[PDB]
Paper text:
X-ray crystal structures were determined for the inactive and activated states at resolutions of 2.3 and 2.0 Å, respectively. Both activity states crystallized in the same P6522 space group but with different unit-cell dimensions; in both crystal forms the asymmetric unit contained a monomer. For both conformational states, no electron density was observed for the 12 C-terminal residues (221–232), suggesting a highly flexible C-terminal tail. While one might expect long linkers such as those in the VanRSc structures to be highly flexible, the linkers are well ordered in the crystals of both activity states. In the structure of inactive VanRSc the linkers from two adjacent molecules in the crystal lattice associate in an antiparallel manner, leading to the formation of a symmetric pair of hydrogen bonds between the carbonyl O atom of Arg123 and the amide proton of Arg123′ of the symmetry mate, along with a similarly symmetric pair of hydrogen bonds between the side chain of Arg123 and the carbonyl O atom of Pro124′. In contrast, in the crystals of the inactive form of VanRSc none of the lattice contacts appear to correspond to biologically meaningful interfaces. The main structural differences between the two activity states center around the stability of α4 and the oligomeric state of the protein. Comparison of the two structures illustrates that phosphorylation of VanR is accompanied by a disorder-to-order transition of helix 4, which lies within the receiver domain of the protein. The inactive conformation of the protein does not appear intrinsically unable to bind DNA; rather, it is proposed that in the activated form DNA binding is enhanced by an avidity effect contributed by the receiver-domain dimerization.
Residue numbers in the entry: 0 to 81, 94 to 219
Amino acid sequence: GMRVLIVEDEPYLAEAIRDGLRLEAIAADIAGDGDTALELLSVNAYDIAVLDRDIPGPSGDEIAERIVASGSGMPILMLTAAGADDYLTKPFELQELALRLRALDRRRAHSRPPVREIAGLRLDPFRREVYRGGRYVALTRKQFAVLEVLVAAEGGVVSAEELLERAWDENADPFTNAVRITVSALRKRLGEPGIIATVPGVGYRIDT
Ligand SMILES: [Mg+2]
């Protein structure tokens, strides 16, 4: 079934909302503040984020911006007292929330969430961290952006030109030596065994 993240700070409310979804076959994790929300987003995968706007720590709008920047396409539903796919005013009927969640999910029912793990690597875009078999590998911003694209291709081949468009600038001056030296540095950082394969005329890919 569906897994959602509920971020709401009002006492008992986050737990009560998860409770109302339980028998709707919609499971949920909860958080009362933005720091906990980000920590959960670094570890678990969710189908939708339900975010109260005014919460302690990083606000609900700041969480929404970081989800949007992650490039996952995960739908976001904001809760308001009274960017984002939809907004819901508190208090709301539970059937109303379950309807919005299902509608948001089925719009993208056949799309796939990003590939963040392959061949031992785990990539977390929220903390911008890479783990190889559980071992932390520090990476520069450019190295991470290139690796993020290669991992998301799940062994598919990515040209040096696409890496330049996606990790430097969509209308960049097509010079690919910078991409080549960055991939080479990434290979040194990741270590043995070799995980980034070169396809001579086309580009690079994650091996196995
Ligand atoms: Mg609040």
